[PDB]
Symmetry: C2
Subunit: 458 residues, 2 copies
């Protein structure tokens, strides 16, 4: 007994502030019922805290840092490209090869060049934001009611802008409880109340998708993976609060396999990586997990929870950072490469990560233990974050963010190209030819997504 379909309900930028996680600030009945009849994961940690890093990792099955996909965003311009290795199979291509129809409605946002028709064969792509391909809308639930499919639906999550729907409650910014030692201003309180409203919008959209499956008798045989690509990125001065940036909601539901999925627990507290989502998707559908994928089937009998979960943060827009985190059952550890410098937090007693324990003698052994888990991971994956981005990749940042990039990478680039700082890179550098094993489609939007230069930023 395997499900017929896989469906990822893929939310942008959302923390699990919903009834199923015990939070009754707003009413989330669809999510609560959905969680009650499925498997809820309370320790699912994505490999990255930002869009294109997480989304590239889950679609390739590996840490975004292993294949040079770690920088948000990257490989978008005509003159700067990353290609997956020859022979490589993304998760959708694995499903296509096994006979399924595949789609992703909404943004891809991956940090490599690709022929989308090899990944998603049930619909066409179109130009998206900042070099991304997007998947066109279509009546997937009707068209594929009798064709086994791996689909994704991208929902706006915390980035929903429109709250005029008569089902969105009032949320008073003055009633919001902020994290400890977090900036308490009208703007942060407004961001909190807005994020609660987006929980209701997510709850509504979940209800609509479940109805659409039900109206085409697709609800029983579809394994649904319900998750966000990261939580809200929160800053206390310069300190990123990683725990609730990488820990995301995850509910897995397969109605006709309920008892099989719940066998290890209807509420899973063991440590899960977001990279286990594609691997579990493959296993549930009866597709081998490639040996080079990092994920595991979280429902297999041999799966007893990860000892630790690794996350990575690299460049974000025009901020050239590099940090690596080891999450164990009790601690989050951070290695910060651009303050060498280390952080360690006991989450049980310090959930907002205020008390760095790295320099306390009592915690030296736990510190070294987390550090060594990280060194093992760097040695195993050859973390491409250790290597600097190229001239062409820096030029791509300049095309998109212009004067906003004040990093020493960007200034040094300007000092070396004073003749062309504001000339679009596609007029400075030759286009990158796609490799023999993957010719560039002639589809017109493939050239439109490469027009990344933004005059308004210089």
């Amino acid at each position: 007994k395997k499900p017929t379909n896989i469906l990822w309900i893929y939310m942008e930028d959302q923390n699990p502030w919903n009834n199923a996680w015990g939070d009754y600030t707003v009413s989330t009945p669809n999510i609560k019922k959905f969680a009650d009849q499925g498997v809820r994961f309370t320790n699912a940690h994505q490999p990255a805290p930002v869009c294109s890093a997480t989304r590239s990792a889950l679609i390739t099955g590996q840490y975004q840092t292993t294949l040079g996909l770690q920088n948000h965003r990257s490989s978008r311009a005509s003159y700067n490209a990353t290609f997956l290795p020859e022979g490589y199979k993304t998760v959708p291509e694995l499903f296509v090869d096994a006979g399924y129809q595949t789609f992703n409605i909404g943004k891809d946002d991956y940090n490599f060049k690709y022929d989308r028709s090899k990944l998603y064969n049930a619909h066409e792509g179109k130009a998206g934001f900042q070099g991304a391909h997007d998947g066109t809308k279509f009546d997937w639930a009707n068209n594929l009611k009798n064709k086994p499919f791996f689909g994704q639906i991208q929902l706006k999550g915390g980035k929903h802008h429109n709250f005029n729907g008569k089902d969105v409650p009032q949320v008073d910014p003055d009633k919001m409880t902020l994290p400890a030692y977090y900036a308490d201003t009208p703007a942060t309180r407004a961001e909190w109340a807005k994020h609660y409203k987006t929980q209701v919008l997510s709850d509504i959209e979940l209800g609509q998708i479940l109805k659409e499956l039900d109206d085409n008798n697709i609800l029983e045989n579809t394994a649904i993976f319900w998750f966000s690509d990261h939580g809200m990125l929160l800053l206390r001065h310069k300190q990123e609060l990683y725990e609730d940036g990488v820990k995301v909601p995850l509910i897995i539901s397969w109605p006709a396999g309920k008892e099989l999925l719940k066998s290890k627990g209807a509420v899973r507290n063991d440590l899960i990586s977001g990279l286990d989502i594609p691997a579990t998707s493959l296993a549930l559908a009866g597709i081998d997990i490639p040996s080079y994928y990092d994920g595991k089937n979280v429902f297999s009998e041999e799966f007893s929870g990860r000892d630790y979960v690794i996350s990575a943060k690299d460049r974000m827009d025009y901020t050239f950072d590099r940090a690596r985190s080891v999450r164990t059952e009790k601690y989050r550890y951070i290695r910060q490469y651009h303050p060498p410098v280390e952080e360690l937090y006991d989450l049980q007693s310090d959930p907002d990560q205020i008390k760095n324990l790295a320099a306390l003698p009592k915690y030296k052994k736990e510190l070294l233990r987390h550090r060594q888990i990280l060194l093992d991971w760097i040695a195993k994956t050859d973390d491409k974050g250790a290597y600097p981005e190229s001239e062409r990749a820096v030029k791509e940042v300049l095309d998109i963010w212009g004067k906003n990039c004040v990093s020493t990478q960007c200034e040094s680039y300007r000092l070396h190209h004073p003749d062309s700082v504001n000339i679009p890179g596609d007029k400075v550098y030759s286009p990158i030819q796609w490799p023999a094993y993957m010719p560039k489609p002639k589809t017109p939007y493939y050239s439109e997504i490469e027009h990344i230069y933004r005059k308004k930023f210089q």
Copy 2:
């Protein structure tokens, strides 16, 4: 029940033309007795056919192509550097961390920068050929007769230069049987007879090392790995004959453990990769094999022979090539990326000298695709770094060492984009590379000498 020591008897550039392999052209009694009492491997295929590629692969435990170590030679200059990832453990470091004394007498010839004292803690290094470190000679068999060690002794193998020893037999070039369609000249017949003489020199040297171990009671408790870094590189026009380039002699002997080793066969014909040598050494000494190593323990109960062995060839001195090979039980497949890639398929049973390319024969289409798919899996799994062009700084290193001999497109384009500095030494053109914080560069003087690789004689 584990051996106490690990020793690699490590030969340069040598084919198994010896009595243990059934070749009595010359007398090799030490090798014959050694193979008789140990385990002989007839299908051991190195991951490369040249020195720095094979040697970097075995010392790191991974295909040289996975870590950017594939180009022979590379990362030698002051301005061009490859470092292993933070936290990475080469095989000697794994033995140091476990308490052993470690040494390699003779050349290292690795394509990355390293602090040799972290690898080999039982002796010092010295300047070597073309940017390599070498290990100084010392009385290892006595110094370490009571200290568990992992050691390597580098022997000259097919590159021995002096044949006046009174026990080197005369070998007639006119009696040499060359490979089918191989150039039949006085030079190649001379090379054949010379190579047979080097078999006797390797036989002598094997006897001496065994005597040193016996004189110090190290003979019983020492697992020895006796092998070469590759066979001779043979060309027929532009075609490299990979089968006998990568397949090397390998004998493993551990006299106190004879019966355990021989359990799966005293003569082993299953497919083995040279990367299984460090993995098997680690296993015998009771050290964990890191999850990122490619080798396996060939004496483990779970080891049932490899279904295939991968080999890779990339730049060789100033020849910028890229070829990948899948060896299966019956066939060797070659994918050639700079002839878009062209493919070769040979049935070795009927075509030992690799003359009849079967790749375009409809009868062999399925065997072709099956070998192609094996290679594609390996590229996807390892992100074969030969898919990426060498940097500007690496081309300069080639130009420094080889000068006007490099006629490649990469070189000729470099000369076009730097017409004013073509013959200026690279260390006056490019700034030195700072070693990473996790591995500071020793002050030791020969570390500066080995980076002086410019050769005026070549331009």
